[PDB]
Design a protein around this ligand. Structure first.
Ligand code: QGZ
Length: 288
């Protein structure tokens, strides 16, 4: 597309912001607020529509985990509710295959989900698929070659370095090589033939390290670390580069946006969000 959308997040409380960053000119635009504040959500795009999935409204007068799917049309600058998921999923991961949205893991109160469900926009309907082999919240999700990957997270007792892969035509999950780092609340995306995992929390510290999984060799390799340690970051890809947005560095809710160039193996600061926040949903689509 053309713009990087950041939706929701957390600073003091869950947020309703929708803001769009244009890498071509450095500008930010504030767009229509989410109908309900939410942090720990995920964003994705299907058919030029932006979707906000799951999360939690951490608010002065209560905390409510979200089963919501909400749809933002850039042409109209309007959010509309879509069909809700079977269960609330805070600290969710999502991935898109063949025009379908996969909602992965997340929490509902003390329940840590292994369940996974798939949304078909053409029918505005969710259906459960096979659950993961592991309960995962703060799970990173990516798609490569029409296979779905769930990476890291927290199973209710331990943060994880494990990862697994979903093969849709077999409706089956299989473990892949674990990462070399325990990561929960990392940013996970795909670039070229690799699954990247950036940042996260390992049980003791927020991380700046970044590693990538080559599906052909089944090995993880570290690349250059980010300039800022961060957990609960947003991540997306735009014209062959990775963008990481916000997060928590153990001291500050970051407004920093960093950009990774894989040809030079370097990170640089490219912009700042209008305010520091963590737990955003991020996706890329046309400008409004
Ligand atoms: O600790 C873990 O293992 C774990 C599992 N999922 N997430 C996760 C993932 C996404 C969002 C949030 N929430 S947030 O409101 O953005 C928030 C983050 C940091 C501090 C205060 C609020 C949390 C985490 C933490 C991030 C590390």
């Amino acid at each position: 597309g053309r713009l990087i959308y950041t939706a929701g997040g957390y600073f003091r409380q869950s947020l309703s912001y929708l803001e769009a960053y244009n890498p071509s000119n450095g500008s930010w635009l504030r767009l229509a607020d989410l109908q309900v504040p939410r942090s720990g959500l995920a964003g994705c795009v299907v058919g030029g529509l932006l979707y906000a999935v799951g999360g939690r409204n951490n608010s002065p007068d209560g905390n409510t985990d979200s089963s919501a799917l909400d749809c933002y049309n850039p042409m109209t600058n309007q959010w509309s509710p879509c069909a809700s998921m079977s269960v609330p999923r805070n600290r969710i991961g999502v991935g898109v295959i063949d025009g379908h949205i996969y909602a992965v893991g997340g929490s509902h109160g003390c329940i840590h989900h292994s369940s996974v469900e798939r949304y078909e926009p053409e029918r505005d309907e969710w259906h459960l698929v096979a659950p993961m082999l592991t309960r995962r919240i703060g799970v990173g999700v990516a798609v490569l070659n029409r296979l779905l990957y769930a990476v890291g997270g927290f199973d209710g007792t331990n943060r994880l370095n494990s990862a697994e892969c979903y093969y849709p035509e077999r409706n089956e999950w299989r473990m892949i090589t674990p990462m070399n780092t325990i990561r929960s609340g990392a940013g996970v995306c795909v670039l070229h033939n690799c699954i990247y995992a950036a940042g996260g929390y390992d049980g003791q510290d927020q991380l700046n390290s970044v590693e990538r999984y080559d599906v052909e060799t089944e090995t993880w390799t570290f690349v250059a670390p980010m300039r800022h340690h961060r957990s609960a970051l947003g991540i997306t890809v735009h014209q062959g580069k990775i963008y990481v947005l916000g997060g928590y560095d153990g001291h500050t809710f970051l407004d920093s946006v960093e950009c990774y160039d894989p040809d030079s193996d370097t990170w640089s600061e490219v912009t700042r969000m209008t305010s520091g926040r963590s737990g955003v949903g991020v996706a890329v689509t046309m400008e409004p």
